[PDB]
Amino acid sequence: NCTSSSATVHWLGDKPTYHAGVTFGLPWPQGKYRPQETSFSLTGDTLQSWATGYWADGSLKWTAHAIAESNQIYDQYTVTASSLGCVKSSSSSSESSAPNSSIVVTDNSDALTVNTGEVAVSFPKGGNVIIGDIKTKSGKVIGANGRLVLQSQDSVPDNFDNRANSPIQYSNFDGNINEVFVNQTSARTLVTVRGNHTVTDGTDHDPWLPFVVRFYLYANSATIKVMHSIVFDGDENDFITGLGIRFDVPLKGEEYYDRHIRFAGVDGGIFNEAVQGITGLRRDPGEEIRAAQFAGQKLADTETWEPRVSTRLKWIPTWADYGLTQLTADGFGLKKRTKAGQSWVNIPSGTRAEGLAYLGGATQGGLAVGLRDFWKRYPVGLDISNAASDTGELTLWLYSPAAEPLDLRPFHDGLGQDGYEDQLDALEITYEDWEPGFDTPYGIARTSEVYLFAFDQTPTSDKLASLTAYMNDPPVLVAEPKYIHETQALGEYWALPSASPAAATLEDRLQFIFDFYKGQIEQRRWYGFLDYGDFMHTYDPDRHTWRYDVGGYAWDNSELSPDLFFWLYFLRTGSKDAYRFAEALTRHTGEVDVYHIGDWKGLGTRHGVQHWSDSAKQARISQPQYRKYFFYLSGGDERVGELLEELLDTDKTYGELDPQRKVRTDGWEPSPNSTVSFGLGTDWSGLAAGWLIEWERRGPRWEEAKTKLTNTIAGIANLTNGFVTGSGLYDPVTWTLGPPPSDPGNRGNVSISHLNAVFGLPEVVSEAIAYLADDIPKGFKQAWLDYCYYYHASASEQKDRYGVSFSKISLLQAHSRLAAYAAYETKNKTLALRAWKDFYASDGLLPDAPWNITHVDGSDVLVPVDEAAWLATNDIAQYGLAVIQNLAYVSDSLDDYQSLE
Amino acid sequence: NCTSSSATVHWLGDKPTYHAGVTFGLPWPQGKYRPQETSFSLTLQSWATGYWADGSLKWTAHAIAESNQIYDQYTVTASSLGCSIVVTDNSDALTVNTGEVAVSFPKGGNVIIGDIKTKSGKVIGANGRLVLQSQDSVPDNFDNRANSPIQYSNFDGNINEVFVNQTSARTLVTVRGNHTVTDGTDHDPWLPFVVRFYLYANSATIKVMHSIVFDGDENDFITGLGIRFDVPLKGEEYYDRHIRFAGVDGGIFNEAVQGITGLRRDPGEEIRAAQFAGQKLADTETWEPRVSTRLKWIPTWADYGLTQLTADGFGLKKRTKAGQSWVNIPSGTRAEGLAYLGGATQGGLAVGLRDFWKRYPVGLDISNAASDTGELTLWLYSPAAEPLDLRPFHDGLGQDGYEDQLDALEITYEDWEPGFDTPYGIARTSEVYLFAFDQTPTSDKLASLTAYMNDPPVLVAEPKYIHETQALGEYWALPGSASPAAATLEDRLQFIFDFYKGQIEQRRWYGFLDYGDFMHTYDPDRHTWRYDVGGYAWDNSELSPDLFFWLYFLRTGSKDAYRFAEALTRHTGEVDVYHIGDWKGLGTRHGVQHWSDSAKQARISQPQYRKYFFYLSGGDERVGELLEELLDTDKTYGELDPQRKVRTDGWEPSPNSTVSFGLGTDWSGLAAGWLIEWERRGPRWEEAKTKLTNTIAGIANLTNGFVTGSGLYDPVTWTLGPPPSDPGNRGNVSISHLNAVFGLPEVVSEAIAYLADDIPKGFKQAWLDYCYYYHASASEQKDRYGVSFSISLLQAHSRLAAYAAYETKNKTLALRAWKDFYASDGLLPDAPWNITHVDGSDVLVPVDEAAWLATNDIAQYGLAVIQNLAYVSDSLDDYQS
Ligand SMILES: [Ca+2]
Ligand SMILES: [Ca+2]
């Protein structure tokens, strides 16, 4: 019979003044709603839907929803779910109403056309043009031949002087379409276009730099959201110099004085000009003619002016090109010229441009284009070309050619390092684990969030400033935290913020950590095309800088799961700032810090001076768990969907590359057609998170992932030392897990690492135990409980059980949460107290650490900066997770712990 | 018998923390002191810079050594008659030795500083060389670079002449030359240069005036311009080699070639703190051995580069060596543009550019710091920037001949012509500083030296004294108000100053060539100054802003005021004037580019504009040089007619043939130039004296005086006769509003006073008549001259009435001067007299505006206030009636 329930959803911060349609996710409790048998309705104070994840029983876990662009914006949106037996025992009569707007698509051998009711855009199925043309509802074309432009060069001169004696061969490229896909729905439609960049001008060069561009169009919207994603293919010789998206804007028929150029400036500023300026001449055509051009309206017929002006328009210059370059994160330049062959006139410019340009006119219409977080991702640009011609160009440079070309080559030569002993010895001084030919960016990726806007006529500047604001803070709808928690669709291991004054200062200290790391991004200028979203790993208290030049201490690359902390922090709080911080991080770490092709497809690169410089290529960085939260909140963002699917191939890498090669003291080395060795902590937490997720989404490979997950859970269980076992051997035909090389026949092996639990293990393990339910392999849960308990048992408790004590245990604050979990699962108050003692005593960040920032200025530093010095990113990340998880599992013990002193 | 007096001299603003030797100037009264006989003491190195008519001292200049002891004031006593650096000559190169540093300058070759030694004898840097890179075309757009590759060419500075003005306290080394190719496509020598090195006793800072004259084709695009040194560091260990960069507002960046801080293992807290402080690291045996072994594994960083390519942002980066990627370094907004390379034991050098970010694109490179020899490079124009493109900004838009050209002038206020859109012969001067160090200095010192170069302390006379000597005109006085009406005038002058000082920042009027100028008229609809409409963009000294801002300094003493007037003069005197070629000595009319207009005219180069700075600086040798160039201005009147377009007449110019001079518009700029050389007693002073006195008597023996609009000048006889509209001199009347507003009243007042009793009969009266009759009734202008006029900038010209009022003791005239001031054109007293702030989506960035004014109005408003107060401030109380 009938089952129905509601969940509410809220704007991430303040209520928007404009949105362009929006997708959101909603969790649902285990077993409540069958797929295909569940309708969903929208209440806005007074619904397009689909599934993104499922429970082990097959019921709905997460769904995504989509609402059209709308004048009417509410403070909150309430979805109601209804089982199908809810309307198949009804005897009432609903009106079936038509939506006021609804998407339609036409299909053809040549092209694919999506009509929202405000625009219609065509997507060629082949060739060197992504978007064929863009029409308003009028029918008129406002822009056309959207194409991807790449430019490269085959070498770099040693320095500026070397230019005269070092030839650079420049080469241009076009986006070649290979595949076009579609997700049609009435409320929004997603066109996914995969491709390749191919030569146009300059030297013949294999096609390269694969792409996939996603176009989101919503009913009733003239706004297209564009998720441009490129994987890097090149080698020592392919230096990128220009990367961008370009449109023709047809202006023929428009008087020059009716053609309009707008660039977004600083803080909701807009730059307002026309191709032929009528304002500030020696003579005046009339107050209202001038006001009108400034406003972007069609100017009165020539006959009504003062004739002093109309007769001499042949002598007023005519500005064909405009250029805006943002080459540092703190200043941009702006210039125009009359045409090629003449010098540019410099325009008064400023600090940080919000990254939108418009080209068009009062009659012919036109389009605006922009990049989200424009200046934060320098070097970038905005070009207008040939605006005094029949067809204008409008270009967004994701990488400005006015910048130095993008050099991805190694930052050093090896410093003489010959083989592992030397490499390991460098590790001891710089924390860098170098290896020859491993400092490579081959396979890394980056996504960019572009927006397109179509106009029937030049819009007001206020509209342009609004769309600019919009683009840079795209409205998000999210589930209430309390509801996400009750559903348990996203972990047992966190809960909301208790009366303990101890607990209250913990919350303050998580806020402190967050406020600090948010501010540092600005202060240390962790900005730029590849860099933005990451932060650094450790500080230099002498120089007052993050150790950007000392091997492993530089870019943090998700070391010790800061990604879990900041996402868990967002879940618990619903803070806008927190989501944005984690959004940015997840777009960096998932794209730039992991390999998407090549022999290492599915491994990421350990923390280093470059995001790819270190040899340790491991699954703990690619760690799918770090993406799960943002995948599901957000309505199954299809890019991350793809990234998660890519990771299913990670097990294949342990045949090509063993992460322990340099330290493994057994015989082992991978060989062909043969069981492969990986870790049970670091490596297996990566593998399992990915398998769990494929199973959850019921994607192409879900059975397989279910098998690999369940068999390895059984293999660890059957290993007589469980996780404490060093870490075993995996068969890539049978999908099973045996004991390691140093112990065939499972007699008992012991290898402990402070790193095994801190890259997702407890989080994946808890979800896996929860998902598998009654089908869980016998005594796997005991083995996990074992690891959790013996890790900071006494040395004699360890020797008793496993044969030897664990001398090299550290990160005791970090592992406090493993006791906390065990304390909850066994209902043991003493084990609970141990979690808190390890949290508050032991290591990491102690409660009596400074817990403040120092300001540093004058001649000590380049710029004024705030600093810790007493903390490092490893510290805060595990602290943060310790606070959250110990509070989830054992808050009932915290005042008890506190009252004993 | 003794004549003795004292004059005191004060810092510009606050007492400086540090100076590196200073030259200042003092005026003296007409007839007080003879040149070789007068001696000067302090509480002193001295020379004459200008003189009065009878040969007595007018302006002196003085130098003091660098001193740890610094005073609030310095008092110079002069007494009438009846009352340390070491230079050495090898047959090869010359060394100046201040006591603290010792610099060798070759007399030829492509190296300009041979070596720099500290007082111990250690060579801290060597091979000072001028550097230049160019390219031969630019692409149309970025896509065009595949199909149109381009020929780069490196050059360096070849020396031709070297001069030495040597004195005990100060020693100026001048080095002329040009840029002579090395690597890249063959190319003739070009880009003539001059580098003046000032060295003072007991200083290791060297001030460096690097001037350049652009003399290339449409095909010469400059991609890089700079000064470069070698820094030795052979003995020094990688972790004892230190790199600094000035950052933002007191900031310094502090690294080392091989860093020992931030490592996985600590060598020692004391060690780590020492590298950070630029000290020699204790013996490696005293380190933690986990760090001292394994030093091999810590990378060395040879190459550092700071690029400042906008006024609001710099990037900073580091590289192990070539063939590896750079690593980006946390950076910021506006770097103050000093770099240091050197070591704890081997010593080093710092270079920088005054006003660095304000003159973008600039850069600082350090290179090969992990090698036997390092390179340290100031880039006055940075390679990381787009090439410097001085070609014209339009193609002519199909203008053909003077009828079209004057038809465009009516809508865009631009007078174009083909071939006149040319930067050939413009110049630019950069103020660079070198600093020599026996060992890596403290970061605190580096910051102090950075602070110093960006605000070089200046020593100036008291305003009461300057005015009292009358050695810079009688046409201004100190503020000290008596009426509330005068007080409001003062407050309005600060309003004008604060607003313009503001707009430089707000409208980013910065850059290599731009910084120092401002713009002409405002577009009130776009809320932008009119940067893109012909003659409404860069002001290029129109209506004598330079006169207003310099006179505003004289009156007040304001540091801000001097600094503004200075930056202006460094622009207008250099990039707005031509220094070589056929137009040498003329400047370009206000435009979109500084050189785009076809009206090349002496009203713009007007030597009066540079006179106040020339003396107050203590004889700035570069402004001195520029003032000599302007003595050739007359030659151009046989090579270009300013009226070639506005002529229903047939006339044309040839060399040594007679020409028409407008008596304000052409003659006052020439008289200015001639009056200055006579005052200085320069190489052409006899020439100058006769050209001035001839033409001054010329104008007196015209029947109608200045009222006769113009004259006819013989280049052969150096004399001035009636205009071709009235040979035989029965009488002419021609009046232009343009004649008084470009320094005419200033030159005439000064000349009358200069000549004294040797003034030609009836010159002063011919002037008073212009001053009286310009805006008298047409009943008073027919009743003499027989043909009543047809008066157009009454506020501006109110000054003239006031001069005549002072001189005639005529209270009717003074009140008319105040009526014309307060109640006609220009800035009326009822005008808004406030700013409007503008933001949101109307503009790119937020701005304050005053659309009710334009630069022409403030320039002439400011002169009228200053001048009317000086001459007729008694008559101001009475005008309130
Ligand atoms: Ca990274
Ligand atoms: Ca100028």
Side-chain angles (χ1 to χ4, degrees), chain B residues 319-402 404-463 465-482 484-550:
Chain B
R319 183 182 63 184
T320 63
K321 58 206 204 183
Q324 324 308 316
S325 68
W326 297 82
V327 354
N328 184 250
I329 301 178
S331 68
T333 45
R334 294 180 174 173
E336 318 208 73
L338 184 145
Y340 166 95
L341 176 64
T345 73
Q346 247 263 213
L349 194 63
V351 305
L353 181 56
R354 174 170 176 186
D355 301 344
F356 185 92
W357 60 273
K358 301 168 153 166
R359 305 169 67 94
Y360 82 95
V362 290
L364 287 150
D365 276 352
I366 282 161
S367 17
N368 304 299
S371 285
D372 282 7
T373 323
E375 271 74 41
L376 160 62
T377 319
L378 174 60
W379 281 113
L380 297 167
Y381 198 92
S382 155
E386 291 313 73
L388 179 69
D389 188 339
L390 315 179
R391 296 174 300 177
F393 85 96
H394 54 67
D395 67 5
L397 324 159
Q399 269 155 112
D400 202 336
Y402 309 163
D404 283 350
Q405 288 161 22
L406 290 159
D407 204 42
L409 203 172
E410 296 298 331
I411 195 60
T412 72
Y413 203 43
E414 161 150 288
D415 187 18
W416 188 69
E417 191 170 344
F420 284 75
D421 311 339
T422 204
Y424 177 97
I426 72 188
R428 188 49 142 171
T429 308
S430 291
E431 195 167 337
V432 179
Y433 286 80
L434 305 167
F435 302 100
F437 297 112
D438 201 41
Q439 44 181 45
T440 298
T442 75
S443 289
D444 276 355
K445 197 182 263 296
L446 282 172
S448 192
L449 300 179
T450 302
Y452 165 82
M453 90 176 184
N454 286 302
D455 191 56
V458 168
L459 229 24
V460 305
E462 291 167 322
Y465 184 62
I466 299 171
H467 170 87
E468 204 194 3
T469 60
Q470 310 192 102
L472 274 184
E474 319 169 23
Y475 43 81
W476 59 268
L478 260 91
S481 303
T488 52
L489 294 180
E490 298 295 351
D491 298 330
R492 278 143 175 211
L493 296 185
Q494 287 165 85
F495 172 82
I496 292 158
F497 184 72
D498 288 339
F499 175 65
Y500 272 87
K501 194 187 153 53
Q503 293 305 278
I504 293 190
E505 175 55 14
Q506 272 172 43
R507 315 294 184 162
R508 311 270 121 108
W509 294 336
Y510 295 125
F512 185 41
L513 301 185
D514 301 338
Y515 172 67
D517 221 352
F518 32 81
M519 291 213 267
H520 178 279
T521 285
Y522 202 66
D523 179 336
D525 290 284
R526 272 183 307 175
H527 309 284
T528 189
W529 284 83
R530 300 206 205 167
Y531 77 97
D532 68 340
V533 307
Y536 290 122
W538 289 114
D539 190 76
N540 288 16
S541 295
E542 226 220 344
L543 268 70
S544 311
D546 315 65
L547 255 53
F548 168 53
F549 291 110
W550 275 109

Side-chain angles (χ1 to χ4, degrees), chain A residues 606-620:
Chain A
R606 171 184 176 277
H607 53 286
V609 171
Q610 294 160 276
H611 305 282
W612 52 86
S613 68
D614 213 271
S615 85
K617 315 311 196 173
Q618 282 203 41
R620 71 183 163 74

